[PDB]
Amino acid sequence: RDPKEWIPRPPEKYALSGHRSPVTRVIFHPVFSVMVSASEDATIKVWDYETGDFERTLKGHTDSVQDISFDHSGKLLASCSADMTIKLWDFQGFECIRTMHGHDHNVSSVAIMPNGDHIVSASRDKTIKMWEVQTGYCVKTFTGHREWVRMVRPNQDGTLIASCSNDQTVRVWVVATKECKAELREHEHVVECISWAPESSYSSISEATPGPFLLSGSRDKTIKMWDVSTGMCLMTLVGHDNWVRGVLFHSGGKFILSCADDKTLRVWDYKNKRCMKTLNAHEHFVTSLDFHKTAPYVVTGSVDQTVKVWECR
Amino acid sequence: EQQMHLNVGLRKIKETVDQVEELRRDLRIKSQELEVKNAAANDKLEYAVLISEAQAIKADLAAVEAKVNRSTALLKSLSAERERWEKTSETFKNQMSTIAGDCLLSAAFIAYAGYFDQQMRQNLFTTWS
């Protein structure tokens, strides 16, 4: 079968355990068959998800890490933590390259735009900072957020940077022009997670309710979707019974896999605007989820010190 | 790994302050509500029911107060760590910046000056410094 329809099935393919803390974020490697997990014990763990084998542990951050981000080459790894530091890791060398200072609070997010030159950083200090990767200097600064900027993601072309914050706003900016192109204020609660829409979804969203489009999930048990060019909420998924912690598109651009704090991993289609399958993944709060582009595997990182890998079928 | 122990240890001692600060305001809330029940018992002077009820409040007030004074010594004993754990937390930015200076002086002393005498090792270290 094609990668288009892939929905995970119970039970888990693997139940990786060995973290001494809640798991905050899990992502796949773009080319290799290995995955990297981030947890609150300041240990960035590397696990082979095909065989369920623990590979390695990178310990450079002296406080709990929040978000980890690869690059599309898979060589550089950007990691953010609450020690006022960001760390750049050589993935082929498995050692740190540089450490970034300048944030005055918990660095709640980190990302790399597809141009392969800089680093985004959203933090608790109501600002976003731009970091030069090769030199190691803080260049630019998005300012205008009024609360805890939760998590940040750049667009697939590298010209739009969107960030959710605790002030019930989704703010989409251009990278160099430093203006808020879209200050979306429709969510009732803190928006905790966004997900940039892929190209194949750009048609599928447009016939559900061109581009660019953006997802967001908040603590009001709702997942809203927005047109960036117009600036309004087109569609909203309700059916979670707690805080939506991570919202994620399908790689083919039809389904949306989203995890929420009510022990639910629910798949949603905007054609029917409902939840077709709900999965009871863990025994506690589920923080983050990730789905591979070419492989039929969904990894799920949760508070219960276990990371669960589920085969998509 | 020395700062991994400091950051977790200084986080939990602020929770112990928070556990004390939860107990302190709840102590005086139950203390002032005890005297209202003590004044309401004399208003009725059901009287035997309120006597056993107010004795349960005072015993629970003792359990709160004994928890407070146990924690107050625990606040007092662990604070002497905090008047040096926080100082080594400030020193972490200082002592990370001088690793490259100190490891240059240390690796030069440990791979080069192993043959020479004390005066010559001191002269080499003075020249490198």
UniProtKB/Swiss-Prot annotation, chain A:
<dbReference type="GO" id="GO:0021987">
    <property type="term" value="P:cerebral cortex development"/>
</dbReference>
<dbReference type="GO" id="GO:0005829">
    <property type="term" value="C:cytosol"/>
</dbReference>
<dbReference type="GO" id="GO:0000235">
    <property type="term" value="C:astral microtubule"/>
</dbReference>
<feature type="repeat" description="WD 3">
    <location>
        <begin position="102"/>
        <end position="141"/>
    </location>
</feature>
<dbReference type="GO" id="GO:0051012">
    <property type="term" value="P:microtubule sliding"/>
</dbReference>
<dbReference type="GO" id="GO:0007254">
    <property type="term" value="P:JNK cascade"/>
</dbReference>
<feature type="repeat" description="WD 7">
    <location>
        <begin position="281"/>
        <end position="313"/>
    </location>
</feature>
<dbReference type="GO" id="GO:0048471">
    <property type="term" value="C:perinuclear region of cytoplasm"/>
</dbReference>
<dbReference type="GO" id="GO:0021895">
    <property type="term" value="P:cerebral cortex neuron differentiation"/>
</dbReference>
<keyword id="KW-0175">Coiled coil</keyword>
<dbReference type="GO" id="GO:0051660">
    <property type="term" value="P:establishment of centrosome localization"/>
</dbReference>
<dbReference type="GO" id="GO:0005875">
    <property type="term" value="C:microtubule associated complex"/>
</dbReference>
<dbReference type="GO" id="GO:0043025">
    <property type="term" value="C:neuronal cell body"/>
</dbReference>
<dbReference type="GO" id="GO:0045931">
    <property type="term" value="P:positive regulation of mitotic cell cycle"/>
</dbReference>
<dbReference type="GO" id="GO:0000776">
    <property type="term" value="C:kinetochore"/>
</dbReference>
<dbReference type="GO" id="GO:0009306">
    <property type="term" value="P:protein secretion"/>
</dbReference>
<feature type="region of interest" description="Interaction with dynein and dynactin">
    <location>
        <begin position="1"/>
        <end position="313"/>
    </location>
</feature>
<dbReference type="GO" id="GO:0016042">
    <property type="term" value="P:lipid catabolic process"/>
</dbReference>
<dbReference type="GO" id="GO:0038026">
    <property type="term" value="P:reelin-mediated signaling pathway"/>
</dbReference>
<keyword id="KW-0963">Cytoplasm</keyword>
<dbReference type="GO" id="GO:0005871">
    <property type="term" value="C:kinesin complex"/>
</dbReference>
<dbReference type="GO" id="GO:0031514">
    <property type="term" value="C:motile cilium"/>
</dbReference>
Swiss-Prot record, chain B:
<protein>
    <recommendedName>
        <fullName>Cytoplasmic dynein 1 heavy chain 1</fullName>
    </recommendedName>
</protein>
<comment type="function">
    <text>Cytoplasmic dynein 1 acts as a motor for the intracellular retrograde motility of vesicles and organelles along microtubules. Dynein has ATPase activity; the force-producing power stroke is thought to occur on release of ADP. Plays a role in mitotic spindle assembly and metaphase plate congression.</text>
</comment>
<comment type="similarity">
    <text>Belongs to the dynein heavy chain family.</text>
</comment>
<comment type="subunit">
    <text>Homodimer. The cytoplasmic dynein 1 complex consists of two catalytic heavy chains (HCs) and a number of non-catalytic subunits presented by intermediate chains (ICs), light intermediate chains (LICs) and light chains (LCs); the composition seems to vary in respect to the IC, LIC and LC composition. The heavy chain homodimer serves as a scaffold for the probable homodimeric assembly of the respective non-catalytic subunits. The ICs and LICs bind directly to the HC dimer and dynein LCs assemble on the IC dimer. Interacts with DYNC1LI1; DYNC1LI1 and DYNC1LI2 bind mutually exclusive to DYNC1H1.</text>
</comment>
<feature type="modified residue" description="N6-acetyllysine">
    <location>
        <position position="76"/>
    </location>
</feature>
